Every structure is written in structure tokens, then in C-alpha cells.
Amino acid sequence: EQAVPIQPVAGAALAAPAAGQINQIDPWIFQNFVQCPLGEFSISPRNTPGEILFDLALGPGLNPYLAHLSAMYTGWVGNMEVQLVLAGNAFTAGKVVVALVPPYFPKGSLTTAQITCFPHVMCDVRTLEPIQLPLLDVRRVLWHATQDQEESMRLVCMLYTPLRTNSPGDESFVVSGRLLSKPAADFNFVYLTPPIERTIYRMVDLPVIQPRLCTHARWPAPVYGLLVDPSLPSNPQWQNGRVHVDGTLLGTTPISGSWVSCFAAEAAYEFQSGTGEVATFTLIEQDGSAYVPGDRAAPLGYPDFSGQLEIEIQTETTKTGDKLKVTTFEMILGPTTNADQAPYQGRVFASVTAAASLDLVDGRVRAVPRSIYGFQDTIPEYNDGLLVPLAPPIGPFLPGEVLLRFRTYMRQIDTADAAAEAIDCALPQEFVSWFASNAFTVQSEALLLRYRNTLTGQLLFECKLYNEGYIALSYSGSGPLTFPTDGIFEVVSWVPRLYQLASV
Amino acid sequence: EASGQDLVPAAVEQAVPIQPVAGAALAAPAAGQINQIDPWIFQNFVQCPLGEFSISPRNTPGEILFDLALGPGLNPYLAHLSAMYTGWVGNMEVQLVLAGNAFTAGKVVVALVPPYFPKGSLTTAQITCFPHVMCDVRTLEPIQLPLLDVRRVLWHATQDQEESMRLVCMLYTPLRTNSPGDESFVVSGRLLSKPAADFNFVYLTPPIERTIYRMVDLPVIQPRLCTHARWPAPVYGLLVDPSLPSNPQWQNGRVHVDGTLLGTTPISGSWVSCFAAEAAYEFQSGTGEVATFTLIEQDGSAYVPGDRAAPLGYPDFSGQLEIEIQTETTKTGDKLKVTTFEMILGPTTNADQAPYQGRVFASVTAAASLDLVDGRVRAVPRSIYGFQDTIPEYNDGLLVPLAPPIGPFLPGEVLLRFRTYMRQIDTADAAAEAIDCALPQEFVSWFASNAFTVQSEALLLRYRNTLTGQLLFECKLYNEGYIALSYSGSGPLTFPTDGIFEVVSWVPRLYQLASV
Amino acid sequence: GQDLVPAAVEQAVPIQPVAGAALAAPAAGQINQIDPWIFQNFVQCPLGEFSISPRNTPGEILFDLALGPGLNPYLAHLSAMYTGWVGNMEVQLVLAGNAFTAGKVVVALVPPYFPKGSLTTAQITCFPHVMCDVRTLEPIQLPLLDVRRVLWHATQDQEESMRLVCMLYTPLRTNSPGDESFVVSGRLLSKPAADFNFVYLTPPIERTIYRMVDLPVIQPRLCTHARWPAPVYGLLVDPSLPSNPQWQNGRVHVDGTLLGTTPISGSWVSCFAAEAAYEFQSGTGEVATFTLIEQDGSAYVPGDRAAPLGYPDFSGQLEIEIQTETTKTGDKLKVTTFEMILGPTTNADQAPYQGRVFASVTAAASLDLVDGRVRAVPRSIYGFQDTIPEYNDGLLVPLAPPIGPFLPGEVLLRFRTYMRQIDTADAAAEAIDCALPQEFVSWFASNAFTVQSEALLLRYRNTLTGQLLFECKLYNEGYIALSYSGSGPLTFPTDGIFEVVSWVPRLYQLASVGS
């Protein structure tokens, strides 16, 4: 334990008068150093001084045992003990500084000159034993609330003096560092409350479903494969299948997978002595509601591709030659306009080459897709020719990383090509529903996933799932590569955005 | 002391697992004054402002009979004293009185809920996980409980509400009676409280009457000397009737207890069934004289379609309304005159009327083509023919914002109506046309001007005769602005209009009223 | 008799001592003491100037200060190396009255968490208070205790503490026939009390709160117009011009929030970057359509602004020069002149809010050009008017509010520039006014200033002599006001320097300017 210019901090002695209870923790927990989340770093000889190696806030989330225990309590108090472990031999050089930042220091960028003005310790990369530090509870309140995130003391480690070493011709040398912690003797909980299952210290989990038994987020068809291809555009701007990890739906994505590529509208039929019968649809919500224009490109579930598709609705005939018929229309979304389709304004048109008088009843219909002709993976004309609010394009990606896609095949009417079409998505609808319902709390930037075989257990690849809702693989090949669709995705831990993945 | 004690008496079994909590000793070095409370206040238990509740056989386990937030609002003395301070701190003592008949059986649980616990769905499983006490409904002596200031600050703020310990009572076992005769008893429980030794206030401030706690009060006026909120006439009767529709959707006379007005109800009683407009006239060889009214706000402001189905004070009933219009002509011989017009606002007939632009059309049969000038007019009602108690058309088959229908009520609960009569045009009948409202315009003005703060869900009121000083019945005034009472008879019931309504206490929606 | 009750007793405020570092020590990391001689001197507060006028009415608030390190320049300077503070202070008040003036004021100690509505003359005396006469010759002092529910305060936020509020108890009256323009000046000073210290020693950060606002040391001649790419020529006021224009460019907040469509650099004004497409089929003419993007290359998405950054906000006809490449060989990239309409005009739908622009150029042959990115900058203006153009077809777009809300007798200070216009009969030059010039929209959003009050008092001086030209109020919205009751426009020399004095409230009265 190093000497730092700081006073002792009182824990339960300050909180006892105004606390209903003071609860004790298992004494076996005070004897083990456990790995802290986001408490690891690697120093390379190509780093410049001033990089923040780690930044961790005091609280129950540092220890998994305390994070589990906090679900049955109302408050907490006390200090912690922290250990830093460095992996370097006797032929290295470089220095590191670990400082104690007070709870209310402003957030921003620090400088190596400024980091030494805090109570701090300076450590050489040749140190043998782990470095022990205290983490004290500097506060203006008597105790903290477990279900609320407040400001506490921070531990910040920054590179101070650059690493100087020799390296072999195959692999480059790095200095690894890890941080562990445990509660100090002065640490307590406050009030015994019934346990809560949805707490802020809850880890993200994924449904146990094979991708072959999932649904596609852009076209209503089962998923037929997952793959990766650097030749396709690396920054697509799809409006469907976008969802945040915390449970925020981005763009025009609906909760249910049946709303995909379909729209609900009220249809007015006008027979013209020229082209023929024309149906004009005024759009409404799929579940049934008034469409209020806002910051969305189109009503939820609207298709987000450019092409020629047909729709079928339920029609009632007023005259007496029949009583109920099912017809088929044709909607044009090609780069020709000439009909002024404005989904944002809440109106669209379609027509058929049908003779005679076929006036019908305007009583609201649901239009489902039938097929596509000349499909293009480009967003449609949400307005006349002008700009509309829409979700940002997928990205950014680190160098050497490429998006992983779930591909599926739709129908065709086109004559030229005869093999197949292909539409891709970033996540199946099951994941969208899972994230929307669970409403997790994101920690830093992204999650480390793991695709493993169901029965053999062999690891296939490791990827990164960003909070914006895309998966990136570290692939440095040339041609497209597909993967088996029988594995299960597993969550490992939270990782920083600048994290290097293992190559395929 | 008492007659046969085949009951529980003292429930001295608590041993509540909680530590003593420091009160005003921690806040003394942080205040700039020395304050204290009258020592005599510390010496007797007084009824809480929300200290009445009922347990009935129709209740089910898991229902919340009451919940109390720690603070000055549990004591009338402390609630009155809090108007001249910022800051309070300390513990309190509570006495629960529930001593039902010896033929009854049941169990309740009272728990200490700490601050920051989420509010809403509390189940019978979780309530026993808190420090709690088990009570039989037959207990003879009062049950004494502590309420402690568990907190992470030095003191609280009297204005605006913070997080404090709660006292929640849940029905653990359904109430049943062993008596053979025809009925099941109802338990009437009471709450009393007094501050503990180390309770204090912090800093003396000017005494402002309109504070958060206060207490709701009603104007001291007999119902017969009040004006109706749906027709410009004095209130003539106080009635209850189960034969009439039970969930009306009246637009006028609707107000919230906290002050907010709902619908098209105006502040003044002269705006009822009257409207101001810009009036233009035309003559056509068909229908004759056609008058068009562009409706505007009666204070001169323009009418903009918003969250209201119509301008304030618009007639919400249906039928044919005959009104009077003052007109000025340019013809030589006379200058000013008053004409009588008729309008049809009943069922939709062959007419082109759209309240979206605020246009109202009146037709008159005439032989001579009168020439007039478009101007400004205000129309008040004169007669009603073919009256119907239903809302008129506002957008010709399209939904418009409206106040929700009055309700809901407990089983056996029926709405109380204030009844007035109008001048009616009749052909071969003689029955006087009658209309009903929920609250008179005096109460609407009182609520809109005072802007009270509601506490739980409703207010308990008692109607007392002034001539003899006799309480006639008790009723529940809901926060949405309607009064309900328990009645099971078939025929209509009438009450004298010489009484005075009095506020008793705050009650929840599950409170059971006595039969009338 | 037995006891004597004096009729004249000196005023005093009774208090109960409040603990400072004694309460905060067990939970604070450190307790740092300050220089022992800072406790010995009253120093003017950063917000320490106010005025009383006969126009004021009883019940009006003259000032209200909050306890903390922002009342003393030494404490405000020292707070840049600490994260917290605790303790009490003392405040001094001086009034520059006369013998012809009658009036009374009350200074009260309002505690934290008292509702911030409106106080009356009856309620103000229910607080601990001191009653002061405007004819007093000596300063009046009061204490300021740290009444709180926490252990200490955080420097970097305002939080809630004890207030010091002063209101006009009795109307100000002068026995003179009047009305004249007599104004009573009031000044505030403060110092720490025996119990006051800081909490945690941190590196000195210069860009913190309680850092006093400064201005660049640049004469108005050496600045740039914020509404036209030309140097600022004149500085003037004019009461015959509209009081509250709706300019969209050249607007900035004191705290650094860019309001409207104003860019950071001065090279973006009245210029735009867009992807161009040219067409000419039978009778439409050589029409170029532009899909707008940001000048730095980023994509444009409709948001809370009515146009991209730097878009013109004046109505007229614009003539611009665009770098265009022609596909025909033997003639490489040139500059083409294009005429475009800014205001409403039929046969077209100008909607810059939606990223669509239409321009036309006279032609008699093919003159074909290739598509791509282009940047258009102004060349000439015809039919200039100071009205916002048609940002949409028939819809309302978000806009900055009109300037307002000047006190009676206050006009708007304007920076005047002359543009390049095309005329046929009138030979008069075209003039355009701005509220704040360029490098004044900059220097904000670069310094994250905290306003701490309602207005800034500035003094305009001469660099070589020091003669005071005028005093003015810089409101937080980013504009200046001057007290002037004349009819004709009045200009000022443009070779001066703007100097900050202090922070003043809304009701501060400026000395009238004139000759």
C-alpha cells in the first residue's frame, strides 16, 4: 500500500444514524481479488504519451459479487482496495501514472502535465509485485442509492513515458496490464428490500435460437444463411432491422415481423377512360391509428428498397355479379416518377390495365407483397424528389473489419437474370424483439460475441456487436465467405470500441 | 373494563427489526436559527387528514387500504405549521384503530417501505419482506407504530415532495362474518398520529396560505341559491336516479378538483348556452332569410380549433334552440330592432354545417327581402323544442376531442344530480323539461380559482341540514369532478336543497359508503 | 420607573452559527485553507452594479445574489484548482444618493428551496433583513450563512444556496419639478467569513465557470461582417429602422450556442456547396438543379435549422460564380455566372430547407457541362431587401425569434457594411446591418462562458486618448443596446475598443448618449 496525500474517509460511521439497518457481507468475499470490468490494457511501442489506459468509477459494479448482492438492498457505503498487475520483463522501459480523480471533476481530455496534479502513484513497467491502491468514498451525502447512478471517485491510468523495447521479426512486443479489486473492511449495505430482477447491473443476453429458425427483418421470408462480403457496399443505409441495444427502434422498424414490407391504407378507386382503374391509398398505421408525420421516413413496416412490386387487397363489389373478390395491383417505385408518390405525405397511387367499370367500396385495406421486378438495394423515394429524415448509415468500421450480413432470397419476375436475388439484413427480427422488450443498460461501447457449435462446442469466430446494432468481423480476405447457420451466439463481456479482434 | 373479551386485545407482538434513527440533532448545525414546536402538541394523538378507511367483504387480498408518506401532512397541527417554514426532520408515532365486531374474522399487514422503492404494483408476496406487523381486525386496543426518517440528507423541504419512508397497509385475509342474520359487517378504521421527541422545523419563512398541503374547502352556500352549469337557470333540485343513464358524456360543468377545466366549461355562468359570433345575412328565393354566424370567443378573441370540441359555453345538448338577435337596419323608418331566430342542432339532417370553421346557419321564412349589414352579435338562449340529452354533431361523422364519460362507480354507487328546468316550446304536452349536472357553476369557479392540491383519490363529504343540524348522508367526490353515493332502490330519490356540503377527509376509490 | 426602553437602537441581524468544515471533514478528501488576508478586505463582486430610478415601482427586484465563490474575485480565481467549497460570507452595499431623494429598500436573506415565484412588499420583511435609506453615507453590511442539507458544494455547478435579494420598499421621489434623469447608483462588495475553505486540490483548469467574460482586442475596422463577405465599415444606431428584425445569420449566444444558420468561419456566409445537374431540352432553358450539402463535405439532413450553414437570409436576386467543367475538349474548367431568385417567385419552387435549389443562365448553344460537386459564392445582388426568403413552398420552418425586448429608451447597436449591387437608376449604395460581426460569433463556442447574470456592461473607449464614447448593455442573446432618445441616425468612430465592466440585470439604466 503506497502513501497518497489524502485523509481517511468515514464509511458506515457517517451513515449509521440515518440508516434503518447496516447489513454485513460474507467474510469470504473480503479475501479475493476479482477482475474488474473494462480493467485491462496493452501498451505497444507505437503509442504516444497521453493515452488513457483505463478509467473506472467506484461502486458495486466493480465486483460481480457485490453487483449481485446489490439487487436486495437500497443503499451502499464504503471504500475499496485495488490491485494493478503489469507483465513486463527486465529489458523494458516506460512509465505509467495512476491518479485519484474526485467525483465532480469535469469530463474531457487530460494531459500528462495535468495528471500529476492529482493524488497519484508513478509505476515502472519493470515492477514485480502488484501495485495496491485505495479507492475512497468522497461524497456529500450519507450513503448512495443502489438503483441510481451517482458521482463517485474515479481511478484513471494514463501512459506517462513511452515503452522502449526490441521486437522479433514475427510478432510485436506489448506490455499487458490488468486491474483487480475487492471491498475494504469498511463497506456495507443499507436496507433489506425484496430482490429485483431488472436492475441496472444486469448483463445483456441473447435468445437461444438457431439463425436458420429465424425471421428476416427486411423481407418476410426465413433466413437462408449468414455471410460476409467486402465487395458489397460497406456502409449500407437500410431503414429496416435497425435497433439499439438499450431498446430504441431506429428508422421504420416495427415490433412485429408481420408488418415487414406491408402497409395499411384506405383505398379510393377512380375509373379513368385513359389508363384505367386507379387506386389511391392514404396510409395509416398497421395496427390501426392515424399517421402523424414526424422524424420518420415512412409508416412502420414500409419497404425500403427500389423496385416494382405488386399488392393484393380485399375488395367488395357493390353491384350484383359477385360479392367478394381478391385483386392484384402494381406499385411503381422506379427512377421515373411521373406519378408523384409521397409516402411521407401519406398518399400513394397504383393502377391496373383493366377495362369496363369496376367501382368498388372504399373501406380500408391491407396490402401485402407478392413479388418484385428489378429490385435494387437502394432506399426508395420517401418524398417527391426532396429530402426526408431517416436513420444514419451503418458505421463506422475499424480498419480490417467488415459487416456480417444475414441473407435471404425473395421472389422474382425479371427475365434477364435467372439464378436468384438476395437481400441482406443486420439482425433478425427475433433479436429486435428481444432488445426492445428487455431494455438493457449499455456499459461502454460494444459487446464481444461468440459463435459456437451446438453439440461439438468448437469456436467458429469472434465478432463485435455495437450499441447501434451491427456486427463486425475482422476479415482480411478477398472473396465472400459464408458460415454455417447452426451455431448459437453467446455474450462474453463489454469491450472498448478500439478493440482488436482475432482474424478469421 | 369492557364487555365480554373473546377478542384479540393488545397486538403487542411487533419487535420490528429496525434501528433507532436520529432526527433533528443532525440538522441543528446546518440551520441558522433556533426553532421549536409547542410542547403541548407532543402530548395527544389527533386524527390524520387521511385517517379514515373501510374494510368490506367485497374486498380482495392484495388491495391497499392506505399508504402514508412521512412528513408534516400526517398531522393537522404540523400541516398548519408547515406553511411558515422551509425544512422539516424527525420521526412520528401512529395509532391504528380497528375494533370490528366479535363476529368478524380477517388479517391485515402494515409494513415499513423505505425511500426509492418503485411505486405501483405491490403484491402480497413482497409486503412480508419488509419490516411488518400482523393485525387482527378484532383488536380492541389501538396498535402503535413508529415512522422513522431514513434518509441521506440532513433535512427535507416542506414545499415539493421528496423520498421518505412509507406506511402501507394491505388486506392479507378476506373479511368474513359469523353472524347468522342476513348481513356482513363492515370495519371502519381510523388513523391518529403525533410527532416524536426529535421532530422539528428548520427556517422561518412568510406564511403563505396557498401551500401544497392546505385542505380543500367548499363555498358556504345552499344549493338552491346557486346557478346551473348547463342551462342559465337556478338549481331547483337535488336528485338521485338509477333509471337514467349512468355514464353521461356532458361537456359543460366538468372541472377537476385541482383546478383544471375539462371540455367547454367557462368560468362565468353567463357564458352557458350562449355564443358570440360575426353575423351575416342573405336573402334567397328558396328558404328565404339565411343568417351565417362565424363563431368566436365571447371575450373578442378569435376561435381556433384546438383541444376543445367547440368554443367555451357552447350548448352540449340536442334539439331546436330559439334565440334572440339584435340587428340594425339601414332602411328609413327605424334603426334598431330585435329579431327571433331558430336553429337546429339535433340529429343530422339535410344541412351544410361544419363547426370546424365555426359556422352556424339559421333559416327564416319571409316574403320581403330584408337588407342588413354583417356585424358582431352575441346569442343567448330563449326556448328549446324537441330537447334531447345527447351531444350534437361536431365534425359530421369524424372524431373530435371530448371529455371522458362520467365514471366509473363502485357496485351500488350512483351519481348525484343537480336538476333544473328550462322554458320549453310544446305542442300537446305539459311535462316540464328537466336537465341535470354534476356540479354547480359556483363550485366550478371555486375550484378554478383556488387551485387545490389533491392527495389520494377522492374527498369524503357529508350533507348536513341547516335548520336542524342533521347529517342527511355521506358521499364521495372524485378527483375528476363528480359525486357518488350508495343507493339500491328502484325509484328516484330527492333531497332538500337547504343543506351545506362539508369536507371530511381524503378517501381512496375502494372506500365503501353507507347505504341511503 | 424600573426599566428604560431606548427609542433608537442600531440595526443588527441575529444569527445562529453554522458549521462548515466540521460537518464536511469526515467525508471530504482534503480540507484546504485560503490566504489569511483574503478575510480582511471587501472586494467588488463580479455582479456588483445596479441602479434605482423614479421609473421603478415598489416590489421590483433590484438584485439577487447567490452564496458561493462567485461573489469574490479572489475566491473565483482560486476555485479553478478545487472541486468543492463550504462556508459563510459577508456582503457590503453602498448607495450614491442625495439629499433631494426619498426612498427605502430592504435587503433580505432568502433560504434555499423557497419557491421562486414573485415576492411582494409585505412578505419581504418576514425574512431576516436590513432596512436601508437611499440617503445613507456609509456602507451597510450583512452576513451570508451556508444553510444546506449537504456536507459541501460542488464548484462546477450552481446547486442551491442562500440568496440575497433587494427590492424597492418605498417609491423613489425627488422634490424637484422633474422628471430629469437622476439615477441612484448601487455597488456590492463581499468577503469570506471565518469559516470558509475548499475541498479537493485539482489541476488548474482555465476554462471553468466563474471565469470572467472577455472580448478580443481588435478594433471594429479590423473585423468582418457576419452577414456579407465584406469588411465592417461603420458603427451606428438608428431609431427609424425596425426595432426587432428577424436576422438568421450573425446570431450567437454568450455561452457559445450557435443560434440560426450562422457558421463558425467567415468564409461560409452567402456561399453553399451542392451537387449540380444541368438540363436543357426544349424550352426550359439551361437550368441547373443543386442538391445542397455542408460546405465541409458532410451530408445535409433537415433538422432544427431552416437551411444549411451560411445560407443567405435576405430576399432578392443573387448573381453567383461557379467553377464548372465542360466536357468539350479544347476548353477546360471555367467560371460561369448564374442568376437565382431568393424571394417568392412563380414558375418555380425554391425550397432550400429541403436541399433543392434551382438556377438559370442565359444561353444560345449547347455549352454542356459535367455534373459533380460545386461551391457557389456571391457576385452581385439586385432588388435587395431585408426580409427572410422563402425557405419552403408553403410551410413554416424553424427560425430564430425576433430580437427584442429592449427597455423603453433603448435602441439596437448596428454594424454597417456596403455590398456590391446592380442598379439602373438609383446610385445610392446598398447598406446591410448586423448585430455582432464576425470573430464575435467566433470566440464563442470556442470559449465556454457561463453567463451568471442577465446582461454585460461594456465601455467603449479610444485607444490613444481614453475618451469614453458610450456605455452599452450586451444581452445574453448576442446583441447590444444603447440608451438614445434622438430621431436621426447617429454614427460612432470605428477605431475604438470594447471593454467589459461587469454583469448587470435587466432593469439596469444606461446613461443617455447625445450632444
Residue numbers in the entry:
A (entry chain C): 27 to 530
B (entry chain B): 15 to 530
C (entry chain A): 18 to 532
Can I see the authors' text?
Once the sequence of the purified mutant virus had been verified to contain the V339I mutation, the structures of V339I apo, V339I + 2 mM CaCl2, and V339I + 10 mM GCDCA were determined from that same sample. The most striking finding was that, unlike the apo wt virus in PBS, apo V339I was in the activated state with the P domain rotated and lying on the surface of the shell. As evidence that this is truly V339I without activating ligands, the inset in Fig. 4A shows the absence of density where GCDCA would be located. The density of the outermost loops (mauve arrow) is disordered, and for these regions, the unsharpened reconstructions were used to better place the main chain atoms. Therefore, this mutation-driven activation process is a simple answer as to how V339I can allosterically block neutralization with all three antibodies. In the apo wt structure, the environment of V339 is markedly hydrophobic and tightly packed. There is simply not enough space in this cavity to accommodate the extra methyl group of Ile that would clash with I337, F307, and F355. We propose that the mutation causes a shift up in the C’ and D’ strands that results in the upward movement of the C’D’ loop. Therefore, this overcrowding mutation is sufficient to push the conformation of the C’D’ loop into the “up” position, leading to the cascade of other conformational changes that activate the virus. The overall CC for the V339I apo P domains of the A and C subunits are 0.69 and 0.67, respectively.
The T=3 icosahedral calicivirus capsid is composed of 180 copies of VP1 with a molecular weight of ~58 kDa, which is divided into the N-terminus (N), the shell (S) and the C-terminal protruding (P) domain (1–5). The S domain forms a shell around the viral RNA genome, while the P domains form protrusions emanating from the shell comprising A/B and C/C dimers. The P domain is further subdivided into P1 and P2 subdomains, with the latter containing the binding sites for cellular receptors and neutralizing antibodies. At conditions found in the gut (i.e., low pH with high metal ion and bile salt concentrations), the P domain rotates and drops onto the shell with intra P domain changes that enhance receptor interactions while blocking antibody binding.
